[PDB]
């Protein structure tokens, strides 16, 4: 199709949505608005989701946000996707919705595993997700993976794909290495993602040219490579200038105190607060961004799970684009804003 402007890897994941009762949540110890994986006691959750009606619609991270960026390119195959499914019903259906939208997929089959499944249980007003991540645990990436990503120059990986291995993010980063012109870009997903792959993103971030991540995210990186003084691990992020000497810090886990002319950013997003970005500029000195967000009253604001997943999709269509650091912000902030205001973790048709 194409030309292929992303390539992400993943874990791909069927979300299926419901609004469920309270003793729903309570049948299946839930804690109402946590996102975990699903316990050996919670093994029905899905099949017992069933007479709920749930809806079934493309998920996981990475997904999301490749299919924000084919959404904005249009052409087919704008943006490509590897990850792994089963060889069960779930797969056919999440494979279908991924390939009506035109995005250029390859999702290797394991067989006797279940496709990743992720409930979206919504209760009093929250959102409590339960994801059992199956076969996507066995995705190996294929060695032909450079020749289906011809011509893409950004490339993602969400800290997520490090439960299969983190040799797969390792692998594509390793090929955007010490080219000036390839970017290797990685979301840090989740608190438990910094702590338990600790070494492996340690030299994972030695090869990333963007990091993408939120405060308690950042929060968490900070104190597992002591970023910060022990005696500002535990200061807020909403604090401007805290959330500044953290991503200035964390830029040096990107730089390792080099510099070259490849991209060197940390991204942390900051919820309704301004993004904050500390970028190593092409002669080494590092500039710090500061780019508000629009305002979105709290009645406005439906859910937002999905948020930063859209952030990314945006910031990276608008890096294909040759945009300044700051419209890549602005283009992430209104990808962002458009999918918490709507039940879906989906840019909206009118978009
Ligand atoms: N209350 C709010 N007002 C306007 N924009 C919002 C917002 N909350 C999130 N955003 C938008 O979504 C982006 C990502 O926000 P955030 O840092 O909260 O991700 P997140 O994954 O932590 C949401 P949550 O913590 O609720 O799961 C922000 O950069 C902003 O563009
Ligand atoms: C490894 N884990 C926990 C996960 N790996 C990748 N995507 C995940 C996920 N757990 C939840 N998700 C997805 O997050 C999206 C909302 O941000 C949902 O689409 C869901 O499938
Ligand atoms: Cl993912
Ligand atoms: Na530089
Ligand atoms: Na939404």
């Known amino acids: 199709t194409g030309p292929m402007r992303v390539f992400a890897i993943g874990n791909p994941i069927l979300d299926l949505v419901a609004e469920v009762p309270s003793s729903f949540l309570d049948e299946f110890f839930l804690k109402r608005g946590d996102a975990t994986l699903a316990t050996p006691e919670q093994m029905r959750i899905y099949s017992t989701l069933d007479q709920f009606n749930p809806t079934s619609l493309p998920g996981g991270s990475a997904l999301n946000s490749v299919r924000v960026v084919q959404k904005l390119l249009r052409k087919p195959g704008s943006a490509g996707y590897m990850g792994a499914i089963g060889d069960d019903p779930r797969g056919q259906v999440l494979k279908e919705l991924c390939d009506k939208e035109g995005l250029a997929t390859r999702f290797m089959v394991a067989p006797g595993q279940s496709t990743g499944v992720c409930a979206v249980l919504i209760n009093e007003k929250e959102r409590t997700l339960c994801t059992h991540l199956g076969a996507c645990g066995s995705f190996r990436l294929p060695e032909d993976w450079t020749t289906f990503a011809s011509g893409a120059l950004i490339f993602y990986a969400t800290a997520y794909t490090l439960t299969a291995t983190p040799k797969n993010a390792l692998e594509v980063a390793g090929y955007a290495h010490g080219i000036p012109n390839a970017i290797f870009t990685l979301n840090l997903s989740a608190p438990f993602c910094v702590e ?42 909403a604090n401007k200038e805290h959330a500044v000497e953290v991503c200035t810090g ?14 060197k950013l940390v991204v942390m997003t900051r919820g309704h607060n301004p993004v904050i970005a500390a970028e190593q500029t092409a002669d080494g000195t590092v500039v710090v961004h500061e780019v508000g967000v629009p305002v979105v009253a709290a009645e406005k604001i439906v859910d937002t799970n999905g948020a930063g997943d859209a952030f990314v999709g945006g910031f990276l269509y608008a890096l294909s684009q040759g945009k300044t650091v700051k419209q890549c912000i602005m283009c992430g902030n209104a990808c962002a804003q458009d999918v918490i205001q709507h039940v879906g973790f989906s840019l909206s048709f009118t978009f």
């Open 196 to 237: 338990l792959y600790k070494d492996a993103m340690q030299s994972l971030l030695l090869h990333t040219n963007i990091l993408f991540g939120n405060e308690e995210e950042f929060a968490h990186l900070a104190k597992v490579h002591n970023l910060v003084a022990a005696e500002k691990t535990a200061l807020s992020t």
């Open 250 to 263: 964390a830029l040096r886990l990107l730089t390792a105190g080099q510099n070259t002319s490849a991209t």
